[model samples]
Target chain A: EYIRMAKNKEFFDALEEIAESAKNDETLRNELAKVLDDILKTDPSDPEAFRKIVAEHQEFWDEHDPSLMEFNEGRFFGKSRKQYLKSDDFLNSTDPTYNFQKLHQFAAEQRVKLGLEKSDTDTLVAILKNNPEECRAYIESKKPGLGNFSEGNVHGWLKEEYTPTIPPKAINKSTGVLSDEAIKRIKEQARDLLLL
Target chain B: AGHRLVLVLGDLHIPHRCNSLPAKFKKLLVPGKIQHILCTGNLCTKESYDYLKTLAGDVHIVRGDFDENLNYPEQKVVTVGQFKIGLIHGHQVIPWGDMASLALLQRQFDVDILISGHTHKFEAFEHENKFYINPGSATGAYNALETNIIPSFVLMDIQASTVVTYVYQLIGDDVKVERIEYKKP
Candidate 1:
C-alpha cells in the first residue's frame, strides 16, 4: 500500500508515515519537521493538525542540540529584531543561551499579531534596511530584558551564542529533492507568499 | 449562459526570480470570458500586480498587510449579476487562524459573499447567510509563522442568486477538484 501510494505520489499517506517516524527517529523527525514546515507555508490554517504533528515531533526537537537552537534564535533575533528594538539592550541580555525555538515561535506569533503576514516583504526589507537606528530602537523596546543595553554588547552576545546542533547535510544524504514538478508546485506557493 | 465573473485568489508571493507561471495554471488563464479579476494583496512587489493587470483589464485589489501599494483599499465590494461580493486580504482579524476573523469581515462588508486569504488554506462555507471563501495560499510559501500546506485555488460561478465554488488542489503535478454551492436568501 505504501509503495503504491509512493508511486502515485499520494503525499497524505506518506506524510502519515513520515509523521510517525518523526516521533521515533531524531533524524527522520528533523527531516519531517522541515517538510512539515514547508507544508505549512501552503496551509497555515491547519493549526490543530499542525499543532498535533509538531507536538509528535516535539521530543525530537526537545533533544535537539541546545547550542544549535541558541545560534539560530540568536541569529534571528540579532538580524530581524534590529527592526523592532535597540542593539544595546538586546546585546546586554546575559542569557546568550536563550532558546531559539522559543524565540522563533514568539516572533512568528508577533508577525501574525502585527498583521505582517499580509504585507509585502519588500516593504519590510526596506524598513529594516533603511532605518537601522530606528529599527535598533524598536528591537530594544520590544525584546524583553533589553533595557539600557549596548550595541557592542548585543553583537558580542549573539556572536558567542551556541552553534547549530544539526550540521547541514548534502541533498543526497537527505531525501532526494521533491521532483521538478513538486518544485514547480512549491514555487507557486513561494509566489503566493511573496505576492500575497 | 451564466454570467462570467473571474474568481481571484490571494497571496502570490513570487520569489526574486521565477518565470511567469506554471504551465497548468497558465492553461486555465486564457483570453476572453473573465469579467473581473478580484485580488487579495501581498503581491510581494508591484511587478507581480502589474503582471496580473496584463492578464485581465478589470482587476480589483485589496491591499494585503504586506502589499507594497499601501494605497490599495483593504476591502472592495462588487455587484455581479445579482450577487454582492466582498473581497478582502484578511490580516486585520487578530490572532491569524480560523474563521472567527472572517465572521467579523462578513459583518463589516455586509455583502452576500466574502472572499479572503491569509491562512493559506482553501475553504468555502456559508455562514449567517453569507458565503465566505478563502482561495488558500496560491503560492504556497512559508507564512509569517512556519507552516506547511498544499497549494490550492478556487473558481466561482456566479448566477442570479447562487454561487458555485470549485476548489482545485495541486499536489506534485496533479490537480484535484472539489465543488460547493451557496445560495443567497
Candidate 2:
C-alpha cells in the first residue's frame, strides 16, 4: 500500500490537474489554499506537493510579522547609565576633588607661612608618585561628586572603564608600516603580558 | 554487488517535529547503497548536513538563503547514471513563492532535474522536458503562510533514459512513499 500510493499515477495525474486549474482559476486557487491550510493544520509534515499547493497561492498571507520586543529593551537601559554621570546634580554633590583641592591649598598656605619649599609642579609630582595608587584612587573617587555621585557608583564606573589590556600593534616610525621586527617584539610583549 | 549510488534528501520542512518520522525511516537510508549525497539546500545547519553525510560519501551542498554558512556554493551541477542534475538553494529567484526562478535555472543549466528548497514545502513539476523539485523544509520549522506540510525527501533511482523519483512523506511515524517517473526525451 505504501509503494502503491507513492507510485500512483492516477493520484499524481489528479494533483497535476488541480495544479493546472489553479494556474488560471482564481476561485479554484483560493479554495485550494484553504484545503492546503486544513491539510497542514492536522499534518504539518505533509509532502512537498502539499506545500507546493500552498506555495502556488502564497500571496494570501504576505502581511505576517513576528515579535522582536525583547531585543529593543536591552538597548534602552545601556544608554541610561552614561547620562546620569554628566548631569548638574553631580557638580553640586560633595565630591572628593573639592577635598583634594582644599588639602593642596592648605599645604600651599603652610608653605607660604613657613617660607619653606616653593609650591611647584615637582612638589605635586613628588606627592603623587609617593602615593601613586592612593592618589589615583582619590582622584577617581572624587569624579562622582559632580552630581548624584556615590563612592559605590564611582568604583563601579571605574571598574567598567578598566578592561583587560591588549598588547599594542606593531609599528615602525620611518615608513609608518609594521616591520617584521616590530611584529615579533609586539608578539613577545603580548605573551609576557598574558603570563604576567 | 554493484556499488549503489547515493540518493541525498532535500529540505522538507515538516512541522510538529516529534511527529515527523518513525524509527524505520532511518532503515531506508542505507549507508553503502547511497554513493553520493546531493543536497538542495536549506538543511538549515551543519548538524542537518552531518546527518545526511553519515549515509554516503561525496556529499555536495549549496547554501540556502537562510543557511548560516555563506561559503557553500549557490548552484552546482552533478552527473550520475547518465543524467545531469542541477542543484540550487532557490531563494535568489525573486517573488519566492513562484516557480519562475526555477524554470529560469532549468533553462540555464539545461539539466534533466533541478532541485531546490525554500517555502518549506514539497513540489515536483516538469516544464519543457525539465524536472524541477523542491524537497521542502525537512525540519518543518514554522510557516504562518502554510501549515502542516508533511516532511519528506526524494529518492531518485538513476536508470537509462528515465529517473525514478520517489517521495517519502512521514505520516504519523511511518513513511508514506509516493513514486513519480520522469523520462528524458
In lDDT terms, which candidate is top?
Answer: 1
Best-performing candidate as measured by DockQ: 1
iRMSD, per candidate, in listed order: 21.0, 26.0
- What is the C-alpha local distance difference test score of candidate 1? 0.52
Q: For residue B65, what is the lDDT in candidate 1?
A: 73
Q: Write the per-residue lDDT of candidate 1 for residues A67-133, one digit (tens) a residue.
A: 2112133643444532222221222122233222222232222222222223356634433342333
Please report, in order, the local distance difference test score of every candidate based on alpha carbons. 0.52, 0.48
Q: After TM-score superposition, what is the CA distance of residue B35 in candidate 2 from its true location, in Å?
A: 1.5
TM-score of each: 0.46, 0.44
Please give the clash total of every predicted structure, in order.
50, 32
- The candidate that achieves the highest TM-score relative to the unseen native structure: 1
Model 1 DockQ class: incorrect
Q: lDDT score of model 2?
A: 0.48
Per-residue CA lDDT of model 1 for B8-63, tens digit only, reads: 67777665323344456556555455667788777667777776776678888898
